[PDB]
Write a protein that binds this ligand. Structure first.
Ligand code: AR6
Ligand code: AR6
Lengths: 158, 158
């Protein structure tokens, strides 16, 4: 059960636990938002993958914040919107090697609170049906958060 | 764009790319299977999180394999079953730090090909509605693969 640390970083630590390679990572949040049949996706260059996958607004929980507060913050910083947020569920992104846990919220009754992360983040309103069709046609890649948003919409928001 | 390697491991590498911390990881597969209203979940101890989340059968793509072949293999190794497999979609588990990509399949017409990973892996057939209710009640944690299976079922398999 003990860990020995190979790297202590900015957004992760690398440890060994016995024979296991473990990446400790801050928890994250993600926000599903629908308006007039379009879901609020975002894209940004992601150096780990060398491309900009289709995501939903997401970010890390910072010191002092709970998940709800982090979700409100990254919705505003990434898209300039506020909404009424409801906790949906959480998931471990890849529990075979990392402890990153993502907390997912629904946002309703959106309002623009900032006109304008604008240089870094592209806001992509798109019907989820179209996002899934583009992905099936090889036109865009998903992050887990983007795919979860699309599936949740099809399951519960039509 | 260049990477310098801090750690070259068994199931990951850690690199720095500029100011970015990047974990390279093999691609993965996951299999959604439904029978008589129950989804095929699995649980195993996951040292990264210190608990056994609810997952679907999943594993790493090994040298020589494509995603379909890996999916067939881990369905058989984890559960002793074979099926007719259909590619659904893929996702990057957490593209802000890792390049791990998961390829998700549906399995139908399941057949037991091995009686019996049996010590390590618990097979948990469970209605997806119940999995989501247990999670909402705080009784179980999800992996991304488990949550994707539950959402896909509710969206398309009822
Ligand atoms: N952290 C680790 N460090 C070193 N070796 C490991 C570790 N975890 C597993 N192994 C060994 O590495 C091999 C792991 O193999 P397989 O069983 O195909 O995959 P999976 O179910 O682990 O992971 C599938 C996905 O599910 C999760 O979301 C994961 O993060 C993945 O995204 C075996 O030899 C293990 O002993
Ligand atoms: N790999 C990295 N290395 C170092 N710093 C980083 C890296 N990536 C981001 N930063 C810095 O770290 C902070 C990252 O912050 P925020 O914007 O809240 O989050 P997110 O959208 O990146 O990640 C949200 C989730 O979406 C994805 O699935 C991710 O993997 C997460 O699971 C900022 O200061 C970045 O400059």
């Amino acid at each position: 059960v003990e860990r020995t640390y190979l790297y202590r970083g900015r957004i992760l630590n690398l440890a060994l636990e016995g024979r296991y390679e473990i990446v400790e990572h801050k928890p994250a949040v993600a926000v599903i938002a629908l308006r007039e049949g379009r879901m609020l996706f975002v894209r940004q260059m992601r150096p780990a993958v060398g491309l900009a996958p289709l995501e939903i607004p997401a970010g890390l929980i910072e010191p002092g914040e709970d998940p709800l507060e982090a979700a409100r913050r990254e919705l505003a910083e990434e898209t300039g919107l506020s909404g009424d947020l409801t906790y949906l569920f959480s998931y471990f992104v890849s529990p075979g090697f990392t402890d990153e846990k993502t907390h997912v919220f629904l946002a309703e009754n959106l309002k623009e609170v900032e006109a304008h992360e604008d240089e870094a983040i592209e806001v992509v309103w798109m019907r989820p049906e179209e996002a899934l069709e583009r992905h099936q046609r090889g036109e865009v890649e998903f992050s887990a958060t983007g795919l979860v948003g699309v599936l949740y919409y099809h399951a519960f928001l039509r």
